[PDB]
Motif scaffolding. Structure first.
Motif, PDB file in Angstrom:
ATOM      1  N   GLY A   1      37.680  30.971  42.806  1.00 53.41           N
ATOM      2  CA  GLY A   1      38.674  32.007  42.569  1.00 53.41           C
ATOM      3  C   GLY A   1      39.636  32.112  43.737  1.00 53.41           C
ATOM      4  O   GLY A   1      39.587  31.298  44.662  1.00 53.41           O
ATOM      5  N   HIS A   2      40.535  33.086  43.678  1.00 49.08           N
ATOM      6  CA  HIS A   2      41.495  33.350  44.725  1.00 49.08           C
ATOM      7  C   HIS A   2      41.170  34.744  45.286  1.00 49.08           C
ATOM      8  O   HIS A   2      41.577  35.760  44.705  1.00 49.08           O
ATOM      9  CB  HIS A   2      42.939  33.240  44.219  1.00 49.08           C
ATOM     10  N   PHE A   3      40.363  34.782  46.361  1.00 56.50           N
ATOM     11  CA  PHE A   3      39.924  36.028  46.997  1.00 56.50           C
ATOM     12  C   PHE A   3      39.214  35.777  48.319  1.00 56.50           C
ATOM     13  O   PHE A   3      38.815  34.658  48.620  1.00 56.50           O
ATOM     14  CB  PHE A   3      38.958  36.811  46.045  1.00 56.50           C
ATOM     15  N   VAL A   4      39.043  36.850  49.092  1.00 56.33           N
ATOM     16  CA  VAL A   4      38.262  36.905  50.330  1.00 56.33           C
ATOM     17  C   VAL A   4      37.367  38.095  50.120  1.00 56.33           C
ATOM     18  O   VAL A   4      37.865  39.151  49.724  1.00 56.33           O
ATOM     19  CB  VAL A   4      39.104  36.989  51.647  1.00 56.33           C
ATOM     20  N   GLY A   5      36.072  37.950  50.353  1.00 55.93           N
ATOM     21  CA  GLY A   5      35.196  39.093  50.109  1.00 55.93           C
ATOM     22  C   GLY A   5      33.920  39.159  50.914  1.00 55.93           C
ATOM     23  O   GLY A   5      33.563  38.222  51.621  1.00 55.93           O
ATOM     24  N   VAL A   6      33.253  40.303  50.829  1.00 52.14           N
ATOM     25  CA  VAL A   6      31.953  40.566  51.424  1.00 52.14           C
ATOM     26  C   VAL A   6      31.024  40.956  50.270  1.00 52.14           C
ATOM     27  O   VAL A   6      31.188  42.027  49.686  1.00 52.14           O
ATOM     28  CB  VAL A   6      32.004  41.632  52.546  1.00 52.14           C
TER      29      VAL A   6
END
Ligand SMILES: [Ca+2]
Ligand SMILES: [Ca+2]
Ligand SMILES: [Ca+2]
Ligand SMILES: [Ca+2]
Ligand SMILES: [Mn+2]
Ligand SMILES: [Mn+2]
Ligand SMILES: [Mn+2]
Ligand SMILES: [Mn+2]
Lengths: 232, 232, 232, 232
Positions: free
Chosen positions: B115-120
């Motif tokens: 996907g297109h994201f940055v996460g915790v």
């Protein structure tokens, strides 16, 4: 896991949980006042009286920690608003350096700016002798008030400042977020190997200082802390 | 400087500050419930409705941010407590991926885990297809649910979990501190270049998902955020 | 409760938190300049980009708010210093009226002086067609630039003006305090039922306009706002 | 016009611009502490030493005013957090009532709750004898601590609270906005005819009180004020 956790919403003189060093006093409102406004080269420090095991010599494990505190610095008539507050980590036998000149040493170092500590300074005076940047700043200090790194900041007289600090043991990263009165956040992060620079057990606290002409109100309002060391 | 600041002690339907996506509901106590317990492959996401300018093509400056939130995951009878919650950052036009299988994708990725994201992520089920570690874990994700890095953690059913996140733009360090019910802290930090992985304008939010057999209560209780971008 | 809070010490282009309408520009010093000095019937408006839910059809509750802002109006060579600034509230779909003549309409009304808005105007030209008082004035506007009420005031060229506004939902009172350069305070208050005059979701902002011969610098320097709506 | 304007970022017990009454002290940080934590039925008050002409027997004109202040109330160990702070207006000869019982009287009234003053109370204890609402509240007081009107509020221990007050002489409206630590705004407004209730010359200030079992830190941090009376 081995965890050290505490929370201070206020402070008091008859509390064995805090070691009071030098010119520190507790005000009637519960605030800690680190420096004496009528003393030359005033130095005052507070320490959490229980030593914290930040690393284990048996496993080689290093603790992570999360800490939040709030402070206030306020200008006083005629004196130059100085020198600032340092949130520091030091050997459990830590004391104000002998013959401390206060001022730019922030109460943690000698005249040359050297000591045994790791800290986050909120420095309100530019000391050329310690290669300070030209404005107010937040700095990450490793055995010196000549900061490993700094970020420009602004110390607003009479403003309550909030700080959140994360130490991640795996990456050895010390991350700092400072919330100013105008709403803006200031951040600074630096890799600091706590296992290499400090002993097994350490003390956490705050220090502030002044000179003959450089003096200001340095207040510690609240402090919460949690450290966790993996014991497997 | 340009600052975005907000604080949610509770939530409500019709609050124009929050974009609701998929199976999200607001409970009478003000908690956000992200997944629907009676739906197969349920996916629910909440976003702060205003796009946030995290970096500027004009100066090359990247914002720093401080954010805190609290969540709760609770087991339900017969279903496998799955799949977890992800705190994420994505392009402002972000939507639940088309044909989302929920489950291990955590509602932010396709079946291949991209996907297109940055996460915790706060992951409560080990997906071999996404190379998940064998136990519950906190992960740092960059355009994939195959985490750049993970740390072992334990998701306690019915426990209120507190998280603090610091993003320091100068070092590009994303630092995470997770405070468990038993008092212990868990930390994870990773260098993530938000300017290289994301557009200038983004949306911040939370996502959670389940499968046919994997379902649990996923609650967002509170959320505070401050970002500051130097404009010069 | 549901709260919207923000604080702008400066502004910038590309800040997604602000909607720019018409002839608005952001100066290098961070000030918003509402009108274009070289355009006839110039109209420029700035809106906080997120709609604010000022009341709820479900509970019947109306929000209270506190807002402060600072502006400056400055004369330019040859043109008549006109027309002024209006702090306004309008439906979330609000746009500069089609075929706007700017001028005495302050960019919020039609030629007859009618529109859908509630506002506080800082009027520097006497428009007989809108029954303006003979001198500069602060006025409270309800769907018209023919003010429900005015108070004499003086717009000093190049002076920084400070305004504080309180809306008390229980009494439906809109109270305004204007701090002039000479030190004096000017106040004006009016009962305005926001639930009766406006939709549930609104936008807050500033508008300024000019004519062919009536042009001046209209600057918005800072803006802080807090609204709180009691929820079920 | 006749204008009174002042601004206190800090206070000093030595300065002649402020009158100190009862158990008030000035802390080294410059904060005013109104009550004595070690005294039964403690009462302390502060007043701007210069009387302010709020209305005229010659013209019948009434002044408008804008005032802002910041305070802090903090809990102390083993005592009920009581009784609160009142921002008050009173005749220039105002003194702590003779034989004051402190407590619910807030240091401005007799045992029956009557006195000669107009005030805005930040009440943290429910006195049934003064028909107090069941929770913490802000109230508009006219010659009585049995408030003309109240609004529910929450006094957060150790939190800095910001208050803005507008008095509009034309509508005789006293409007109050209180900014809490959780972000929410609280407002209360009431029509109060100052000419009918108070003398031409008045003193402005703050008062706080305790009892035997009801004690708490009451601090005044800052105060700005501007009044303008039309003399034509
Ligand atoms: Ca220094
Ligand atoms: Ca998983
Ligand atoms: Ca006009
Ligand atoms: Ca009471
Ligand atoms: Mn320094
Ligand atoms: Mn995972
Ligand atoms: Mn007008
Ligand atoms: Mn009361």
């Amino acid at each position: 896991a081995e965890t050290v956790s505490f929370n201070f919403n206020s402070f008091s003189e008859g509390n064995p949980a805090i070691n009071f060093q030098g010119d520190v006093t507790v005000l009637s409102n519960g605030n800690i006042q680190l420096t004496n406004l009528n003393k030359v080269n005033s130095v005052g420090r507070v320490l959490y009286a229980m030593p914290v095991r930040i690393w284990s010599s048996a496993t080689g494990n290093v603790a992570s920690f999360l800490t939040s505190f709030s402070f206030e610095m306020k200008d006083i008539k005629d004196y130059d608003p100085a020198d600032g507050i340092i949130f520091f980590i030091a050997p459990e036998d830590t004391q104000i350096p002998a013959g401390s000149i206060g001022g730019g040493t922030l109460g943690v170092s000698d005249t040359k700016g050297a000591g045994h500590f790791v800290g986050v300074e909120f420095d309100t005076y530019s000391n050329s002798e310690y290669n300070d940047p030209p404005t107010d700043h937040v700095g990450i200090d490793v055995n010196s008030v000549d900061s490993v790194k700094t970020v420009p900041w602004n110390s607003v007289s009479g403003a309550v400042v909030k700080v959140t600090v994360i130490y991640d043991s795996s990456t050895k990263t010390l991350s700092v977020a400072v919330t100013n009165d105008n709403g803006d956040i200031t951040t600074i992060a630096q890799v600091v190997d706590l296992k290499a620079k400090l002993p097994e057990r350490v003390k956490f606290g705050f220090s502030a200082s002044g000179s003959l002409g450089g003096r200001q109100i340095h207040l510690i309002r609240s402090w919460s802390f949690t450290s966790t060391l993996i014991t497997t």
